[PDB]
Design a protein around this motif. Structure first.
Motif, PDB file in Angstrom:
ATOM      1  N   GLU A   1      36.595  46.942  42.721  1.00 22.70           N
ATOM      2  CA  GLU A   1      36.386  48.247  42.122  1.00 22.70           C
ATOM      3  C   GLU A   1      37.528  49.128  42.576  1.00 22.70           C
ATOM      4  OE1 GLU A   1      32.274  50.195  42.187  1.00 22.70           O
ATOM      5  OE2 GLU A   1      33.459  51.570  43.357  1.00 22.70           O
ATOM      6  N   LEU A   2      37.883  50.111  41.787  1.00 26.42           N
ATOM      7  CA  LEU A   2      39.016  50.935  42.120  1.00 26.42           C
ATOM      8  C   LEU A   2      38.573  52.133  42.914  1.00 26.42           C
ATOM      9  CD1 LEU A   2      41.124  50.828  38.805  1.00 26.42           C
ATOM     10  CD2 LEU A   2      40.875  49.143  40.652  1.00 26.42           C
ATOM     11  N   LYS A   3      39.231  52.352  44.013  1.00 24.13           N
ATOM     12  CA  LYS A   3      38.948  53.471  44.881  1.00 24.13           C
ATOM     13  C   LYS A   3      39.912  54.589  44.526  1.00 24.13           C
ATOM     14  CE  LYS A   3      36.556  50.345  47.066  1.00 24.13           C
ATOM     15  NZ  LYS A   3      35.402  49.734  46.368  1.00 24.13           N
ATOM     16  N   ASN A   4      40.030  55.576  45.361  1.00 19.71           N
ATOM     17  CA  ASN A   4      41.011  56.611  45.115  1.00 19.71           C
ATOM     18  C   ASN A   4      42.145  56.527  46.100  1.00 19.71           C
ATOM     19  OD1 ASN A   4      39.855  57.673  42.738  1.00 19.71           O
ATOM     20  ND2 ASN A   4      38.594  59.098  43.901  1.00 19.71           N
ATOM     21  N   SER A   5      41.835  56.124  47.320  1.00 21.48           N
ATOM     22  CA  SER A   5      42.835  55.998  48.356  1.00 21.48           C
ATOM     23  C   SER A   5      42.777  54.608  48.980  1.00 21.48           C
ATOM     24  CB  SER A   5      42.640  57.071  49.427  1.00 21.48           C
ATOM     25  OG  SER A   5      41.342  56.993  49.993  1.00 21.48           O
ATOM     26  N   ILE A   6      43.815  54.272  49.744  1.00 23.93           N
ATOM     27  CA  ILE A   6      43.956  52.964  50.407  1.00 23.93           C
ATOM     28  C   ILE A   6      42.853  52.777  51.472  1.00 23.93           C
ATOM     29  CG2 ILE A   6      45.467  53.816  52.313  1.00 23.93           C
ATOM     30  CD1 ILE A   6      46.035  50.574  50.335  1.00 23.93           C
ATOM     31  N   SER A   7      42.252  53.875  51.863  1.00 35.02           N
ATOM     32  CA  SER A   7      41.345  53.904  52.960  1.00 35.02           C
ATOM     33  C   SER A   7      39.931  53.491  52.563  1.00 35.02           C
ATOM     34  CB  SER A   7      41.392  55.287  53.582  1.00 35.02           C
ATOM     35  OG  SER A   7      42.736  55.599  53.946  1.00 35.02           O
ATOM     36  N   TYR A   9      39.708  50.958  50.486  1.00 38.60           N
ATOM     37  CA  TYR A   9      40.022  49.648  50.024  1.00 38.60           C
ATOM     38  C   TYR A   9      39.883  48.692  51.132  1.00 38.60           C
ATOM     39  CZ  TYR A   9      41.723  50.391  45.223  1.00 38.60           C
ATOM     40  OH  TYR A   9      41.756  50.656  43.882  1.00 38.60           O
ATOM     41  N   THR A  10      39.026  47.752  50.964  1.00 39.62           N
ATOM     42  CA  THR A  10      38.931  46.690  51.892  1.00 39.62           C
ATOM     43  C   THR A  10      40.006  45.712  51.491  1.00 39.62           C
ATOM     44  OG1 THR A  10      37.347  45.506  50.495  1.00 39.62           O
ATOM     45  CG2 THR A  10      36.455  47.018  52.099  1.00 39.62           C
ATOM     46  N   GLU A  11      40.273  44.720  52.290  1.00 42.55           N
ATOM     47  CA  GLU A  11      41.264  43.746  51.906  1.00 42.55           C
ATOM     48  C   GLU A  11      40.898  43.073  50.577  1.00 42.55           C
ATOM     49  OE1 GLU A  11      41.001  41.574  55.925  1.00 42.55           O
ATOM     50  OE2 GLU A  11      40.730  39.978  54.464  1.00 42.55           O
ATOM     51  N   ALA A  12      39.653  42.661  50.433  1.00 43.78           N
ATOM     52  CA  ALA A  12      39.195  42.022  49.202  1.00 43.78           C
ATOM     53  C   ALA A  12      39.121  43.017  48.032  1.00 43.78           C
ATOM     54  CB  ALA A  12      37.869  41.315  49.407  1.00 43.78           C
ATOM     55  N   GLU A  13      38.697  44.254  48.280  1.00 43.20           N
ATOM     56  CA  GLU A  13      38.694  45.264  47.210  1.00 43.20           C
ATOM     57  C   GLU A  13      40.095  45.564  46.761  1.00 43.20           C
ATOM     58  OE1 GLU A  13      36.058  47.376  45.295  1.00 43.20           O
ATOM     59  OE2 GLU A  13      35.754  45.236  45.554  1.00 43.20           O
ATOM     60  N   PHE A  14      41.018  45.492  47.686  1.00 44.76           N
ATOM     61  CA  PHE A  14      42.384  45.709  47.367  1.00 44.76           C
ATOM     62  C   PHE A  14      42.896  44.536  46.568  1.00 44.76           C
ATOM     63  CE2 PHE A  14      46.940  46.298  48.276  1.00 44.76           C
ATOM     64  CZ  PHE A  14      47.039  47.575  47.799  1.00 44.76           C
ATOM     65  N   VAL A  15      42.547  43.307  46.988  1.00 45.76           N
ATOM     66  CA  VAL A  15      42.957  42.125  46.243  1.00 45.76           C
ATOM     67  C   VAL A  15      42.351  42.131  44.842  1.00 45.76           C
ATOM     68  CG1 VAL A  15      43.104  40.724  48.381  1.00 45.76           C
ATOM     69  CG2 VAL A  15      41.309  40.214  46.736  1.00 45.76           C
ATOM     70  N   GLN A  16      41.181  42.755  44.696  1.00 48.84           N
ATOM     71  CA  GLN A  16      40.526  42.902  43.431  1.00 48.84           C
ATOM     72  C   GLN A  16      41.427  43.718  42.497  1.00 48.84           C
ATOM     73  OE1 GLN A  16      38.883  45.634  41.698  1.00 48.84           O
ATOM     74  NE2 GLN A  16      38.145  44.169  40.210  1.00 48.84           N
ATOM     75  N   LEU A  17      41.968  44.815  43.027  1.00 47.79           N
ATOM     76  CA  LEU A  17      42.931  45.653  42.307  1.00 47.79           C
ATOM     77  C   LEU A  17      44.162  44.848  41.987  1.00 47.79           C
ATOM     78  CD1 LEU A  17      44.232  48.471  41.459  1.00 47.79           C
ATOM     79  CD2 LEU A  17      45.093  48.537  43.793  1.00 47.79           C
ATOM     80  N   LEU A  18      44.635  44.157  42.984  1.00 52.48           N
ATOM     81  CA  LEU A  18      45.814  43.314  42.910  1.00 52.48           C
ATOM     82  C   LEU A  18      45.677  42.236  41.848  1.00 52.48           C
ATOM     83  CD1 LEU A  18      46.646  42.999  46.613  1.00 52.48           C
ATOM     84  CD2 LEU A  18      47.413  44.638  44.971  1.00 52.48           C
TER      85      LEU A  18
END
Length: 93
Positions: A1-7, A9-18
């Motif tokens: 899911e997309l957050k607003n800031s890097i903070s 973002y979990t590693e996996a949530e970030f990879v989700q974006l990625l």
């Protein structure tokens, strides 16, 4: 899911974006592709934000030793930069 800031973002949530960035990059879209590209670079604040996306794709295409060649390696590049810069990176969750 997309957050607003890097903070948020979990590693996996970030990879989700990625992975979505991967998706929109290989599909070559614009609306979301440009969102994600910018979104990524704005949260990571990496100077080469999108150069990382773009190299990750090429690194994946060539694939030397796995790492960096894929969405889960973009994050990996960001974690080190964020840490070295002394910036708050990903969260846990």
């Amino acid at each position: 899911e997309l957050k607003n800031s890097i903070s948020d973002y979990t590693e996996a949530e970030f990879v989700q974006l990625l992975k979505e960035i991967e998706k929109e990059n290989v599909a070559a879209t614009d609306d979301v592709l440009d969102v994600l590209l910018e979104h990524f670079v704005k949260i990571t604040e990496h100077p080469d934000g999108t150069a990382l996306i773009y190299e990750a794709a090429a690194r994946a295409a060539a694939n030397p030793g796995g790492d960096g060649g894929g969405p889960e390696g973009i994050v990996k590049e960001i974690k080190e930069w964020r840490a070295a810069n002394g910036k708050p990176g990903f969260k846990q969750g």
